Amino acid sequence: RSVLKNTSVIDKIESYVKQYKPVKIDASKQLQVIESFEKHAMTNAKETESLVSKELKD
Amino acid sequence: QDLYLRELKDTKLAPSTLQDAEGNVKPWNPPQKPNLPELELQGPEALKAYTEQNVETAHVAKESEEGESEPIEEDWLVLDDAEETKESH
Protein backbone atom coordinates (compact mmCIF):
# COMPACT_ATOMS: atom_id res chain seq x y z
CA ARG A 1 0.00 0.00 0.00
CA SER A 2 2.74 2.48 0.92
CA VAL A 3 4.42 1.72 -2.41
CA LEU A 4 1.54 3.62 -4.01
CA LYS A 5 2.06 7.14 -2.66
CA ASN A 6 -1.12 8.14 -4.54
CA THR A 7 -3.12 5.60 -2.56
CA SER A 8 -6.77 6.67 -3.07
CA VAL A 9 -8.21 3.16 -3.72
CA ILE A 10 -6.18 0.81 -1.54
CA ASP A 11 -8.33 1.50 1.49
CA LYS A 12 -11.35 0.99 -0.80
CA ILE A 13 -10.23 -2.34 -2.25
CA GLU A 14 -8.77 -3.42 1.10
CA SER A 15 -12.10 -2.92 2.86
CA TYR A 16 -13.69 -4.53 -0.19
CA VAL A 17 -11.65 -7.68 0.43
CA LYS A 18 -12.26 -7.48 4.20
CA GLN A 19 -15.93 -7.01 3.34
CA TYR A 20 -15.94 -10.23 1.32
CA LYS A 21 -13.58 -11.88 3.85
CA PRO A 22 -16.60 -14.11 4.64
CA VAL A 23 -16.48 -15.36 1.03
CA LYS A 24 -19.03 -18.22 1.01
CA ILE A 25 -19.51 -21.37 3.07
CA ASP A 26 -18.74 -24.80 1.61
CA ALA A 27 -21.09 -27.56 0.43
CA SER A 28 -21.49 -30.42 2.91
CA LYS A 29 -24.95 -30.90 1.44
CA GLN A 30 -24.86 -34.64 0.75
CA LEU A 31 -25.70 -36.69 3.79
CA GLN A 32 -28.83 -38.43 2.41
CA VAL A 33 -28.16 -39.56 -1.16
CA ILE A 34 -24.49 -40.44 -0.49
CA GLU A 35 -25.55 -42.72 2.36
CA SER A 36 -27.98 -44.36 -0.06
CA PHE A 37 -25.10 -45.00 -2.48
CA GLU A 38 -23.04 -46.62 0.27
CA LYS A 39 -26.20 -48.42 1.44
CA HIS A 40 -26.51 -50.13 -1.95
CA ALA A 41 -22.74 -50.66 -1.72
CA MET A 42 -22.91 -52.43 1.65
CA THR A 43 -26.00 -54.32 0.43
CA ASN A 44 -24.46 -55.82 -2.71
CA ALA A 45 -21.10 -56.19 -0.95
CA LYS A 46 -22.46 -58.29 1.90
CA GLU A 47 -24.52 -60.29 -0.63
CA THR A 48 -21.31 -61.07 -2.53
CA GLU A 49 -19.31 -61.69 0.66
CA SER A 50 -21.81 -64.11 2.18
CA LEU A 51 -22.21 -65.92 -1.14
CA VAL A 52 -18.48 -66.40 -1.67
CA SER A 53 -17.88 -67.35 1.98
CA LYS A 54 -20.52 -70.04 1.56
CA GLU A 55 -19.43 -71.27 -1.87
CA LEU A 56 -15.71 -71.46 -0.99
CA LYS A 57 -16.32 -74.13 1.65
CA ASP A 58 -19.09 -75.59 -0.55
CA GLN B 1 28.84 31.12 -7.42
CA ASP B 2 26.36 33.38 -9.22
CA LEU B 3 26.53 31.03 -12.22
CA TYR B 4 25.49 28.15 -9.97
CA LEU B 5 23.13 30.15 -7.77
CA ARG B 6 21.17 31.96 -10.48
CA GLU B 7 20.93 28.86 -12.69
CA LEU B 8 19.69 26.80 -9.75
CA LYS B 9 17.24 29.46 -8.60
CA ASP B 10 15.70 29.72 -12.06
CA THR B 11 15.85 25.91 -12.14
CA LYS B 12 13.80 25.74 -8.95
CA LEU B 13 11.57 28.75 -9.55
CA ALA B 14 10.31 28.43 -13.12
CA PRO B 15 8.77 25.02 -12.26
CA SER B 16 7.87 26.30 -8.78
CA THR B 17 4.90 28.04 -10.42
CA LEU B 18 3.99 24.59 -11.78
CA GLN B 19 4.27 22.52 -8.59
CA ASP B 20 4.40 24.63 -5.41
CA ALA B 21 1.82 27.31 -6.21
CA GLU B 22 -0.99 26.06 -8.44
CA GLY B 23 -0.71 28.78 -11.06
CA ASN B 24 -1.04 26.25 -13.87
CA VAL B 25 1.94 26.95 -16.12
CA LYS B 26 2.68 30.34 -17.66
CA PRO B 27 4.73 29.06 -20.71
CA TRP B 28 2.54 26.04 -21.55
CA ASN B 29 -0.57 26.99 -23.51
CA PRO B 30 -2.34 23.67 -22.70
CA PRO B 31 -3.16 23.36 -18.99
CA GLN B 32 -1.53 20.82 -16.68
CA LYS B 33 -4.36 20.26 -14.19
CA PRO B 34 -7.01 18.46 -16.44
CA ASN B 35 -4.52 15.83 -17.63
CA LEU B 36 -3.10 13.72 -14.77
CA PRO B 37 -5.24 14.54 -11.65
CA GLU B 38 -8.52 14.83 -13.60
CA LEU B 39 -8.62 13.00 -16.94
CA GLU B 40 -5.99 10.34 -16.31
CA LEU B 41 -6.83 10.18 -12.62
CA GLN B 42 -8.98 7.40 -14.03
CA GLY B 43 -5.85 6.57 -16.07
CA PRO B 44 -4.97 3.08 -14.79
CA GLU B 45 -8.68 2.27 -14.84
CA ALA B 46 -8.69 3.68 -18.34
CA LEU B 47 -5.69 1.36 -18.72
CA LYS B 48 -7.63 -1.44 -16.99
CA ALA B 49 -11.31 -2.29 -16.88
CA TYR B 50 -13.57 -0.21 -14.68
CA THR B 51 -16.52 -1.55 -12.58
CA GLU B 52 -15.56 -5.21 -12.89
CA GLN B 53 -11.78 -5.39 -12.58
CA ASN B 54 -11.09 -2.42 -10.30
CA VAL B 55 -14.32 -2.77 -8.33
CA GLU B 56 -13.00 -6.39 -8.34
CA THR B 57 -16.41 -8.25 -8.37
CA ALA B 58 -16.77 -9.96 -5.01
CA HIS B 59 -18.85 -12.64 -6.70
CA VAL B 60 -20.71 -15.49 -5.04
CA ALA B 61 -19.65 -18.91 -6.27
CA LYS B 62 -22.24 -20.52 -8.53
CA GLU B 63 -23.36 -23.47 -6.44
CA SER B 64 -23.15 -26.83 -8.17
CA GLU B 65 -24.96 -29.72 -6.49
CA GLU B 66 -24.82 -33.49 -6.00
CA GLY B 67 -26.56 -35.85 -8.48
CA GLU B 68 -30.06 -34.42 -7.82
CA SER B 69 -30.53 -36.66 -4.72
CA GLU B 70 -32.15 -39.47 -6.74
CA PRO B 71 -30.59 -42.83 -5.77
CA ILE B 72 -33.23 -45.31 -6.99
CA GLU B 73 -34.06 -45.15 -10.70
CA GLU B 74 -30.35 -44.65 -11.39
CA ASP B 75 -28.65 -46.93 -8.82
CA TRP B 76 -30.73 -49.93 -9.81
CA LEU B 77 -29.95 -49.27 -13.47
CA VAL B 78 -26.30 -49.02 -12.39
CA LEU B 79 -26.65 -52.41 -10.70
CA ASP B 80 -28.29 -53.94 -13.79
CA ASP B 81 -25.61 -52.46 -16.06
CA ALA B 82 -23.06 -53.77 -13.56
CA GLU B 83 -24.54 -57.24 -14.03
CA GLU B 84 -24.00 -56.54 -17.74
CA THR B 85 -20.39 -55.41 -17.28
CA LYS B 86 -19.65 -58.40 -15.05
CA GLU B 87 -21.05 -60.62 -17.81
CA SER B 88 -18.45 -58.77 -19.87
CA HIS B 89 -15.88 -59.09 -17.05
Q: Nearest chain A Cα to B69, which residue?
A: A33
The single-letter DSSP state of residue A3 is T
Residues in B touching A36 (Cβ below 8 Å) = 71, 75
Q: For residue A20, give the nearest of B55, B48, B65 by alpha carbon.
A: B55
CA A29 to chain centre: 8
- Alpha carbons within 13 angstroms on the beta-carbon side of residue B78 total 10
Angle at A35 between CA B84 and CA B75, to 5 degrees: 25
The answer to whether the beta carbons of residues A33 and B71 sit under 8 Å apart is yes
The verdict on a CB contact (< 8 Å) between A33 and B71 is yes
Would you list the DSSP string of B45-72?
Answer: HHHS-TTTTSS----------SSTT--S
Nearest to B66 among A19, A24, A30 (CB): A30
The Cα–Cα gap between A25 and B15 comes to 56
**Closest alpha carbon to B15 in B30, B3, B27:** B27
CB-nearest to B56 from A16, A33, A40 is: A16
* Contact criterion met (CB below 8 Å) for A10 and A4: yes
